[PDB]
Each structure stands twice: as C-alpha cells, then as structure tokens.
Amino acid sequence: ETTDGVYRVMTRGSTQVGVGVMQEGVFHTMWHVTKGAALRSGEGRLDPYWGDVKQDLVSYCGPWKLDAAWDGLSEVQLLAVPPGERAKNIQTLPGIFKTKDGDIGAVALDYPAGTSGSPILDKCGRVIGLYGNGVVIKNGSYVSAITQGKR
Amino acid sequence: VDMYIERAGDITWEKDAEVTGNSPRLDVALDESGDFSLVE
Ligand SMILES: N=C(N)N[C@@H]1CCCCNC(=O)[C@H](Cc2cccc(CN)c2)NC(=O)[C@H](CCCCN)NC(=O)Cc2cccc(c2)CNC(=O)[C@@H](CC2CCCCC2)NC1=O
C-alpha cells in the first residue's frame, strides 16, 4: 500500500540505505538512495516515475508532489529516521547554501548515510525538502541542503 | 537485490522539540552530478 507517512528504504539480513515520504500516492526519496530501482511495498511494486541526478531526487508512482518551501526565516524540524533508531524530530534554524543560482536553506545536523531522504518540516508539518545531499566543512561536521523538487 | 520500504512514522511537527545546531552561511557550487562543494 501507499499510505501517507515516512518510510525506511531497506535492502536484503537487511540494511537501511535511506528514507522517504509517501504523500498523495507518490513515494519521494533521494536519487542516491535507490538509483531509481523499483521498490517493494508489502506485496506491491512501486516504479520510478520521475528523477533528476543533479537535484538528487526521484519519485515513484507519480510526479513530485512536495511543493512547500522554507520561508527563509523560521526554524524547521528534521524528522530524522536513522538506521536502527526510532524516528525523532530535531528543531534547528537553517543556514544557507549561497550559490550562483540563488540561495538554498541548509541544516547543520549530522546522521548516518542511511538517514538520507529524511524529511524536513515547517511548523505546519509540510515537507519543505529532504535531508542528505550536502557538504563537509573544515571541522568535519556536515551541512545538508534542504533539497526540494518542482511540482 | 530486494529493495523495499517499511513504515517508520507519521509526518508531524513536535510541539516541544530540542532546538540545536548552528546556521552556517556557505558559498557552494553544484556540479551536474548533483554534488555540492565548498568554494574557496
Ligand atoms: N560528517 C559527515 N561526513 N557526515 C555524513 C552525513 C551523511 C548524511 C546522509 N548523506 C549522505 O550519506 C551523502 C551521500 C552522498 C555522497 C556523495 C554524493 C551524493 C549525491 N550527490 C550523496 N553524503 C554527503 O552528503 C557528503 C557529500 C560531500 C560532497 C563533497 N563534494 N558525503 C560525506 O559526508 C562523505 C564522508 C566524508 C568523510 C567521512 C564520512 C563520510 C564518514 N561519516 C559517516 O559515516 C557519518 C558519521 C556520522 C554518524 C552519526 C553521528 C555523526 C557522525 N557521517 C556522514 O556520513
């Protein structure tokens, strides 16, 4: 089934390779998690519908549905789903990735590789992007873009 | 290779949540493979 929620992405003992969001009958995750491979959901199969390696995003079953945007001002919550750990909300004020093509919100929170795809939320619970494509800074810590697609 | 999904939770804002982390302002570039890098 495709019931709304946050999901672990597993491979098979099993390994957690990432995370994603079911919304409006579409599964959303980061491209580097699945490489567009088909996903088993219960007894069903989810097939890739759209993707873009440069955005590092892929959707299954239909077009990208997540269209909420960080307001550039407010605190957000990472709904982190780390491998082997319960989902947990982490509140933070985003920094900024300043690029030649505009600014992107970015969160300075560090989690294992298989946390990739965990959703980032605004105060209304809308998903404003996915966690896990970022950079490593001089002290070794991590900053993730708030990666959002186009609906 | 069997790739599958399993539900992990409801997508909800937590009303009394830990506020943490800093808010860095970074100049970065994005190549065609979707990789960010720091500029310097
Ligand atoms: N402090 C560090 N390094 N934190 C990272 C946090 C990873 C969060 C999920 N995202 C990823 O795995 C992607 C994958 C990916 C990789 C490459 C391309 C793409 C697609 N364009 C995706 N990756 C990243 O974005 C960055 C990208 C950098 C791009 C530069 N042009 N790549 C790394 O970080 C690689 C790296 C570097 C040094 C050391 C490590 C990995 C090993 N570190 C880990 O094992 C965990 C350790 C955590 C465990 C929980 C407690 C806190 C520490 N951390 C970490 O792994």
Side-chain angles (χ1 to χ4, degrees), chain A residues 2-11 13-34 36-42 44-85 87 89-97 99-122 124-137 139-149 151, chain B residues 2-14 17 19-39:
Chain A
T2 54
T3 66
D4 291 342
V6 62
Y7 289 71
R8 303 171 195 274
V9 185
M10 312 293 297
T11 54
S14 282
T15 301
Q16 181 175 318
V17 293
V19 183
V21 171
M22 197 74 68
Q23 181 179 305
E24 293 169 70
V26 172
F27 193 66
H28 307 77
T29 190
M30 301 207 81
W31 183 83
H32 74 260
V33 171
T34 69
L39 298 175
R40 175 169 67 77
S41 185
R45 173 181 173 167
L46 312 185
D47 296 316
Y49 187 94
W50 167 88
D52 179 348
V53 71
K54 181 170 184 192
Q55 297 178 242
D56 196 17
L57 292 181
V58 60
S59 67
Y60 292 75
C61 302
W64 188 270
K65 301 289 184 171
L66 313 181
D67 57 2
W70 183 47
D71 70 1
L73 208 78
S74 301
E75 291 171 16
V76 308
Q77 285 183 1
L78 173 62
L79 177 44
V81 188
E85 303 192 305
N89 292 67
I90 309 298
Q91 193 158 319
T92 195
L93 180 71
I96 307 295
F97 282 178
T99 83
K100 76 192 175 184
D101 304 307
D103 298 349
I104 306 163
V107 295
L109 302 170
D110 204 353
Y111 282 96
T115 319
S116 294
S118 289
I120 300 160
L121 311 189
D122 69 19
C124 294
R126 288 138 66 209
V127 181
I128 54 172
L130 307 185
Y131 171 92
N133 196 28
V135 299
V136 178
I137 60 171
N139 68 7
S141 62
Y142 183 65
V143 187
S144 174
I146 300 175
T147 295
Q148 181 64 293
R151 183 211 178 112
Chain B
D2 173 30
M3 198 169 284
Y4 64 99
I5 65 172
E6 52 179 60
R7 209 163 177 287
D10 289 10
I11 298 174
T12 289
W13 176 275
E14 181 177 19
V19 181
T20 190
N22 50 63
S23 309
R25 314 248 309 283
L26 305 167
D27 290 319
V28 310
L30 176 66
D31 68 18
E32 288 294 291
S33 297
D35 290 350
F36 291 106
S37 60
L38 297 170
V39 176

